[PDB]
Amino acid sequence: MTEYKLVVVGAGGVGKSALTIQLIQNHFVDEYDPTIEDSYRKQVVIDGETCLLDILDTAGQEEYSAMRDQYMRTGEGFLCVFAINNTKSFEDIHQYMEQIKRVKDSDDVPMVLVGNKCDLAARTVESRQAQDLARSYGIPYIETSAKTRQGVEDAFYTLVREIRQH
Numbered sequence: 013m014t015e016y017k018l019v020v021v022g023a024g025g026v027g028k029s030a031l032t033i034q035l036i037q038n039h040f041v042d043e044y045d046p047t048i049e050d051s052y053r054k055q056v057v058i059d060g061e062t063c064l065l066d067i068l069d070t071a072g073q074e075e076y077s078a079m080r081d082q083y084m085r086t087g088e089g090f091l092c093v094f095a096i097n098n099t100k101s102f103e104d105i106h107q108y109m110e111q112i113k114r115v116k117d118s119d120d121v122p123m124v125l126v127g128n129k130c131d132l133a134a135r136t137v138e139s140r141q142a143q144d145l146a147r148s149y150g151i152p153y154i155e156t157s158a159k160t161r162q163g164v165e166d167a168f169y170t171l172v173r174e175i176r177q178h
């Protein structure tokens with residue numbers, strides 16, 4: 013079957029794992045559990061076609077810089093996650109997206125910009141700001157809550173469609 017090599021990237025704590033676990037395991041559990049590197053392979057049906065999502069859940073730590081080049085080199089499309097209540101994570105996601113371009117020698121890499129934690133009241137990143145960033149890359153912006161599941165399928169399936177129609 014067709015495989016989509018998806019990589020979830022973003023600063024520590026933005027909800028990369030929570031999003032992936034909501035997608036794959038249909039649940040949210042509030043807990044502290046930093047990622048080293050986890051892989052999820054899940055056979056789904058998207059628009060009537062069977063495909064394998066191979067999802068790489070990465071670490072937010074800025075100390076794992078070299079291991080970052082390697083999964084960007086081999087990843088197909090990128091879920092670029094920040095949290096809407098964390099301005100620093102929004103500045104950081106710009107750096108991740110530039111790094112993807114450098115490692116992959118392309119500004120045509122399928123990406124979705126994801127503003128996660130949209131259930132929380134203390135928003136510090138306005139949607140329009142994120143929209144402008146995504147527009148400059150030519151990519152979609154989608155807000156998500158791993159807690160409520162709002163937008164989670166949207167974000168991941170939109171990334172798949174961005175690859176499929178690349």
Ligand SMILES: Nc1nc2c(ncn2[C@@H]2O[C@H](COP(=O)(O)OP(=O)(O)NP(=O)(O)O)[C@@H](O)[C@H]2O)c(=O)[nH]1
Nearest residue numbers: 024025026027028029030046047072129157158159
């Ligand atoms: N309210 C709310 N909390 C969320 C959401 N997504 C994640 N969290 C919470 O935010 C914290 C960090 O989530 P986590 O998924 O571990 O983040 P991460 O980006 O994978 N971290 P790391 O880079 O260290 O692996 C956890 O307490 C988690 O429950 C969300 O959509 N809403």
Ligand SMILES: [Ca+2]
Nearest residue numbers: 114115116117
């Ligand atoms: Ca290069």
Ligand SMILES: [Ca+2]
Nearest residue numbers: 150151152174
């Ligand atoms: Ca598009």
Ligand SMILES: [Mg+2]
Nearest residue numbers: 028029046047
């Ligand atoms: Mg994680």
Ligand SMILES: [Mg+2]
Nearest residue numbers: 118119120121
């Ligand atoms: Mg181009």
